[PDB]
């Protein structure tokens, strides 16, 4: 378990971004914050919901609302772009951490992804095994969620992601792939690829002819 | 005042054990849990243990069965042992310090880099390759399944065709094998007329294979 917050979460420069750790055992116990950038030691970036540790900017502000936790960033800089991750302390597993907010500052004009799904093909049902491709491309941050649909409801295994890669142009791309039996394929009306950026969310969707 | 800095492996292969050590500046090992952590995608950030100079150790449940960490406080070091890792305990990870007494309130402090461990199969393997079919542009591509190491390159029709090409970075999966797929973006005026042909070649395998992209019905 890891409570709830945002996956994205961006901003212009000098804008304020806001992060939401909640969950309800976020009421019990005070929630900490993380900073996470790679090749870099992650520090302590809040500490006691509202509490600001040493050599800390005093832009970052913290504060915290019935079963929701928040950080704030006031004036954010290029700096701040990194993983935050919310903790909170627990009983039996001693910690509990966030699913992680990858705050992105701005950076470019933003950009919609290019989306292209493919079906599995006949030659590798011939050879049993199955799998779905959806392709994302040239998008502006570098942040989305792929969630999988078999007919219209959610695919839980078989579900592989990549993490979004910059590209020549500046832009991201990132792919997606549901490994299938056989039978499962065919078995469904239909299934959907569908990949939210920012606000938008766009869908693409394929059937067993 | 008070530094930690980790050594791990880097690549481990499936199944065999994972050993990560740190390693404490100056301070001797006192008022601190030494703990490990790691940090990805998918599955996020958790705790993995910590320990005391005395032998005191807590670990995470879904990972306590595993997981074994020790001290050297002679060395001035703390290890971790895994036991047994896939392809999901690919991860970044970290070791870090927290204060001896009250944990409520507590948070870790001190973190090192720390070191990326990724877990893949043990034995070189060849690709897999699947035509993309298509549907004033359409795209069409080429899969490349279940391989390692890396790299694998991808060129259509022996590099003829280099235009609208883009060739995705691979997804390290559970089995502990890379997979990508490359595609091309051609006129919808095209097709029934110039062929179109992925070249992929895996050299760690000496695997070379050439596919035949055209719509089906």
């Known amino acids: 378990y890891e409570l709830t917050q945002p996956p994205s979460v961006s901003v212009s420069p000098g804008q304020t971004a806001t992060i939401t750790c909640s969950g309800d055992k976020v009421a019990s116990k005070n929630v900490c914050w993380y900073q996470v950038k790679p090749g870099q030691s992650p520090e302590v970036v809040m500490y006691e919901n509202y509490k600001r540790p040493s050599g800390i900017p005093d832009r970052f502000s913290g504060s915290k609302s019935g079963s929701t936790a928040t950080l704030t960033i006031r004036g954010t800089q290029a700096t701040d772009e990194a993983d935050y991750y919310c903790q909170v302390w627990d009983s039996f597993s001693t910690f509990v951490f966030g699913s992680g907010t990858q705050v992105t500052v701005l950076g470019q004009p933003k950009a919609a992804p290019s989306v292209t799904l493919f079906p599995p093909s006949s030659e590798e049902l011939q050879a049993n095994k199955a799998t779905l491709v959806c392709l994302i491309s040239d998008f502006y941050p570098g942040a989305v969620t792929v969630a999988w649909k078999a007919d219209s409801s959610p695919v839980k295994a078989g579900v592989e992601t990549t993490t979004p890669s910059k590209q020549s142009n500046n832009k991201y791309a990132a792919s997606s792939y549901l490994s299938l039996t056989p039978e499962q394929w065919k078995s469904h009306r239909s299934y959907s690829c569908q990949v939210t950026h920012e606000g938008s969310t766009v869908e693409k969707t394929v059937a067993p002819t | 005042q008070v530094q930690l800095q980790e050594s791990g492996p880097g690549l481990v292969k499936s199944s065999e054990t994972l050993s990560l050590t740190c390693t404490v500046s100056?301070?001797?090992?006192?008022?601190?849990?030494w703990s490990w952590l790691r940090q990805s995608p998918v599955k996020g950030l958790e705790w993995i243990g910590y320990?005391?100079?005395?032998?005191?150790?807590n670990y995470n449940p879904s990972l306590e069965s595993r997981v074994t960490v020790s001290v050297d406080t002679s060395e001035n070091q703390f290890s971790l042992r895994l036991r047994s890792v896939t392809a999901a305990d690919t991860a970044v990870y970290y070791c870090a310090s927290l204060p001896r007494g009250q944990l409520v309130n507590a948070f870790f402090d001190n973190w090192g880099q720390g070191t990326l461990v990724t877990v893949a199969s043990a034995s070189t393997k060849g690709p897999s390759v699947f035509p993309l079919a298509p549907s004033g542009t359409a795209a069409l591509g080429c899969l490349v399944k279940d391989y390692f190491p890396e790299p694998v390159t991808v060129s259509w029709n022996s590099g003829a065709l280099t235009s609208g090409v883009h060739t995705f970075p691979a997804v390290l999966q559970s089995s502990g094998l890379y997979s990508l797929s490359s595609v091309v973006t051609v006129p919808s005026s095209s097709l029934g007329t110039q062929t179109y042909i992925c070249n992929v070649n895996h050299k760690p395998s000496n695997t070379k294979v050439d596919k035949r992209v055209e719509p089906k019905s």
């Open positions: 100056g301070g001797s090992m006192g008022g601190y849990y």
């Open positions: 320990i005391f100079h005395t032998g005191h150790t």
